[PDB]
Amino acid sequence: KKKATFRAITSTLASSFKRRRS
Amino acid sequence: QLTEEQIAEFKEAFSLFDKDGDGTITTKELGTVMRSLGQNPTEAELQDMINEVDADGNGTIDFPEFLTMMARSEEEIREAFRVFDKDGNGYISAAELRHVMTNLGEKLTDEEVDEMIREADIDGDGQVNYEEFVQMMT
Ligand SMILES: [Ca+2]
Ligand SMILES: [Ca+2]
Ligand SMILES: [Ca+2]
Ligand SMILES: [Ca+2]
């Protein structure tokens, strides 16, 4: 593979953290 | 920009999230993925994550929505780096990445993994440090 898979997992993690509550 | 090889790669990445191969990613599928990477979003957080990438508002993410998201701070990247750097030593190894990919339901040859590492690696030591990880994202 390459960066696309790596980036996809990384971007979804980012989402988690950018979207948390209290 | 964006090659047919990259669209291909994002299409298989989408399949890591779309567990049942029905062509959409649900909140339930996202939750499964997130817990496999050591996180614990609530039901309402997962819906938030979906609703941000859900362009048509239908409640699920399809590949065009996923691809769009992928077309495109300190703490989120550090937090993500720590997901992969399982032993905390500051370097992502091929075996750590292997382990992450296997948790996502993906059995990869030792060669595929090494290419992922190789593509992220900048100094040529065979591992991915934090600065290399930051660059991969940006
Ligand atoms: Ca699905
Ligand atoms: Ca949608
Ligand atoms: Ca490590
Ligand atoms: Ca390196």
- Name the DSSP letter for residue B91: E
Instruction: Specify whether the CB–CB gap between B35 and B23 falls below 8 A.
Output: no
Q: Which residues of B are annotated as a binding site for Ca(2+)?
A: 18, 20, 22, 24, 29, 54, 56, 58, 60, 65, 85, 87, 89, 91, 96, 121, 123, 125, 127, 132
**How far is it, in rounded angstroms, from Cα B104 to Cα B80?**
15
Query: Both tokens of residue B108?
Result: 């990869």
The per-residue DSSP string of B17-67 comes to: H-TT-SSEE-HHHHHHHHHHTT----HHHHHHHHHHH-SS-SSSEEHHHHH
* Secondary structure letter of residue B108 according to DSSP: -
* Assigned fold of B1-138: Recoverin; domain 1 (1.10.238)
Residues, chain A, total?
22
Here the tokens at position B131 are 């600065």
Resolution number, Å: 1.9
Q: Where are the domains of chain B?
A: 1-138
DSSP code string of A1-22:
--HHHHHHHHHHHHHHHHT---
